Paper text:
SARS-CoV-2 Omicron variants feature highly mutated spike proteins with extraordinary abilities in evading antibodies isolated earlier in the pandemic. YB9-258 and YB13-292 demonstrate best cross-neutralization abilities towards VOCs, including the Omicron BA.1 variant. RBD substitutions in Kappa (L452R, E484Q) and Lambda (L452Q, F490S) variants abolish YB13-292 binding. To understand neutralizing activities of cross-neutralizing antibodies identified by our activity assays we determined the cryo-EM structures of the most potent YB9-258 and YB13-292 antibodies in complex with various spikes proteins.
Instead, the 4 amino acid “SNIL” insertion in YB13-292 is identified to directly mediate enhanced interactions with SARS-CoV-2 RBD. The 3.8 Å resolution focused refined structure reveals that this insertion introduces hydrophobic residues 55Iins, 56Lins at the tip of HCDR2. In addition to hydrophobic contacts mediated by the “SNIL” insertion, binding of antibody YB13-292 is strengthened by additional interactions including a hydrogen bond between R104 of HCDR3 and backbone carbonyl oxygen of RBD residue 484, cation-π interaction between R106 of HCDR3 and F490, and further contact near A484 by HCDR3. Consistent with structural data, substitutions at 452, 484 and 490, all within the epitope, affect YB13-292 binding. Substitutions at 417 and 478, outside of the epitope, have very little effect. Again, analysis of YB13-292 binding reveals that residues introduced by SHM facilitate more extensive interactions between YB13-292 and RBD, conferring resistance to RBD substitutions.
Numbering used by the authors:
A (entry chain L): 1 to 78, 89 to 219
B (entry chain H): 2 to 234
C (entry chain C): 332 to 517
């Protein structure tokens, strides 16, 4: 019936100051006696989500007395976070909140692995160029073959937040057949960052182990 | 107080799937609750609802717009059991199902087409419901050639990648758990052919490339395959 | 007239109802001896008012009003014509001039599982007391103050119904008891 949108896609957080997230609705949820119908959820990685803030400004059990509930009418302002709509049958959730910690800007490390000789006889050639320890949100990694751009054949995977140094690591895999791999020799991936003045180019050729 | 449930498995499109939920530590027959499913890619989404027996004389059953009338669910007062039946499945219907539970404990101002509730106080452990037309495949691990360009010239990152494996839960150990420095794991990505691909890479200094032995062990309980493959530059 | 009065299913059912939702049944034009009620070893005292249990066979009456419920220990003494308390003024109240008595026995081996059993519920919040021989089954919330609770759990908003906790490891005073009430009128 309706769609609930969240303004902040990704913002850094620090223990010194509280954060701020908002959920935007399209219908009035005041109903009677000023009872706003909008919840807030906190989901741990790999765990069942629970209830922290419910019914708008009201608070539930288990709160750390920090996530205060504020909001009136169609405006509300307080892992991943979700909001509830309790007026119609569809319960719309949050899309992409993903609260992550503030980290120092770190230059990533571009690496390439040529496919093995065992994979060449299987008829499918897979080459993966990845990068590590770098502020998130650099999914513009592209695969280039002989100064040509290819799309629709690259998949990207994102790991969760570690507790050692709080650094992500994204792997970008590329898959072609043997016929498309034997017709080309130069394969290169482009790595970009907001902490890099210029992009770094890493390339290799077929003919060495 | 917690909710425990099981019954997940590999289900072909169509047919029936046995999904049941159990309740302990709290009263079951006086609680109105529903079901919540979570896709692996996107967030949570609402699927269905069911009113309690003693809360209202007339039972209220609600379903989502996409599955209105497709799903037939019910609850049992005896032995604290909640059921969920299936009749037809789609390839986009895969998700993780949570046994939702509400703290409202009452029903009012609810018709046969709508019923508002305040919140969901507690959610149980999820089940892995996965649909696949293809059968089970045996895993295959393929070494890769290391390179030493970034993180100075003395460090070379190499790993072991697995291709054409099924199902999603797979465990990879490096040096029988001894080498835990620089280990990262990625979650599974679904291809257009229904299989999965993954890589496991451990960063190591390149000064020990000729002496230290690198072994990768792949644990795959549903496939019952244990493959140990050595990697060399 | 000679027929078998159905006095078996009244207290031999597999599952009983709650305290607030006791079932009322009516049986007529039947005779039945009262000597069957001595089979159980943990059978409690009859402690009957008005009519003695000894002279319960030759006496002839009109109708039988039987209701049954499952309660915890230290609770069969509150079922009296003149009495006050929690379970007497909220769930089941007896008239002062009522003639008849109750039947109670230990049921720890039947109405108890290895896990927490909460199928039996009882009501302990009400705005006012109830008249004798009245059943009040309702899920409407009550207000404990000036807060208009519109079916929202929170401060000064509590559900009247609460669930019993029955376990085999509990003591005698917390064991479940199967109680069936008998009423005699002329
Ligand atoms: C109730 O069941 C028990 C066990 O089957 C039996 O001994 C008893 O006679 C029954 N009660 C009546 C009134 O028949």
């Amino acid at each position: 019936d309706i769609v609930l949108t969240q303004s902040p896609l990704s913002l850094p957080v620090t223990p010194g100051e509280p954060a701020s997230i908002s959920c935007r609705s399209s219908q009035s949820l005041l109903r009677s006696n000023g009872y706003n119908y909008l919840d807030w959820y906190l989901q741990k990685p790999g765990q069942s989500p629970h209830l922290l803030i419910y019914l708008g400004s009201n608070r539930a059990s288990g709160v750390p007395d920090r996530f205060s509930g504020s909001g009136s009418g169609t405006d509300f302002t307080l892992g991943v976070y979700y909001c509830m709509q309790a007026l119609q049958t569809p319960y719309t959730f949050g899309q992409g909140t993903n609260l992550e910690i503030k980290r120092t800007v770190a230059a990533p490390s571009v690496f390439i692995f040529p496919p093995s000789d065992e994979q060449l006889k299987s008829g499918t050639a897979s080459v993966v160029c990845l990068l590590n320890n770098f502020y998130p949100r650099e999914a513009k990694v592209q695969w280039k073959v002989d100064n040509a751009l290819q799309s629709g054949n690259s998949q990207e995977s994102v790991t969760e937040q570690d507790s050692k140094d709080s650094t992500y690591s994204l792997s970008s895999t590329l898959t072609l057949s043997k016929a498309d791999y034997e017709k080309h020799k130069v394969y290169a991936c482009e790595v970009t960052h907001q902490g890099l003045s210029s992009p770094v180019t890493k390339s290799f050729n077929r003919g060495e182990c | 107080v917690q909710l425990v449930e099981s019954g997940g498995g590999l289900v072909k499109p169509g047919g029936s799937l046995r999904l049941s939920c159990a309740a302990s530590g709290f009263s079951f027959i006086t609680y109105n609750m529903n079901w919540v499913r979570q896709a692996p890619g996107k967030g949570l989404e609402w699927v269905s609802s069911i009113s309690s027996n003693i809360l209202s004389s007339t039972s209220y059953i609600y379903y989502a717009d996409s599955v209105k009338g497709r799903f037939t669910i019910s609850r049992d007062d005896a032995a604290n059991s909640l059921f969920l039946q299936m009749n037809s499945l789609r390839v986009e219907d895969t998700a993780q199902y949570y046994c939702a539970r509400t703290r409202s404990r009452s029903v009012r101002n609810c018709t046969s087409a709508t019923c508002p509730v305040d919140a969901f106080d507690l959610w149980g452990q999820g089940t892995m419901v996965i649909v696949s037309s293809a059968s089970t495949k045996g895993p295959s691990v393929f070494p890769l050639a290391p390179s030493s360009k970034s993180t100075s010239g003395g460090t070379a990152a190499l790993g072991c990648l697995v291709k054409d494996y099924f199902p999603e839960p797979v465990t990879v150990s490096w040096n029988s758990g001894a080498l835990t420095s620089g280990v990262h794991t990625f979650p599974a990505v679904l291809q257009s052919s229904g299989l999965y691909s993954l890589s496991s890479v451990v960063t190591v200094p390149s000064s020990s490339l000729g002496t230290q032995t690198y072994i990768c062990n792949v644990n795959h309980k549903p496939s019952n395959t244990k493959v140990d493959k050595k990697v060399e530059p | 007239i000679t027929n078998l009065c159905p006095f078996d299913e009244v207290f031999n059912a597999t599952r009983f109802a709650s305290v607030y939702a006791w079932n009322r049944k009516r049986i007529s034009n039947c005779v039945a001896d009262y000597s069957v009620l001595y089979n159980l070893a943990p059978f409690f005292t009859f402690k009957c008012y008005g009519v003695s249990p000894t002279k319960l066979n030759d006496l002839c009456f009109t109708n039988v009003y039987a209701d049954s419920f499952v309660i915890r220990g230290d609770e069969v003494r509150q079922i009296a014509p003149g009495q006050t308390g929690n379970i007497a003024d909220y769930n089941y109240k007896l008239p002062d001039d009522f003639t008849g008595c109750v039947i109670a026995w230990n049921s720890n081996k039947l109405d108890s599982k290895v896990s927490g059993n909460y199928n039996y519920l009882y009501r302990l919040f009400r705005k006012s007391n109830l008249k004798p021989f009245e059943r009040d089954i309702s899920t409407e919330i009550y207000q404990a103050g000036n807060k208009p609770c519109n079916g929202v759990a929170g401060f000064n908003c509590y559900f009247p119904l609460r669930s019993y906790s029955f376990r085999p490891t509990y003591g005698v005073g917390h064991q479940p008891y199967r109680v069936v009430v008998l009423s005699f009128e002329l």
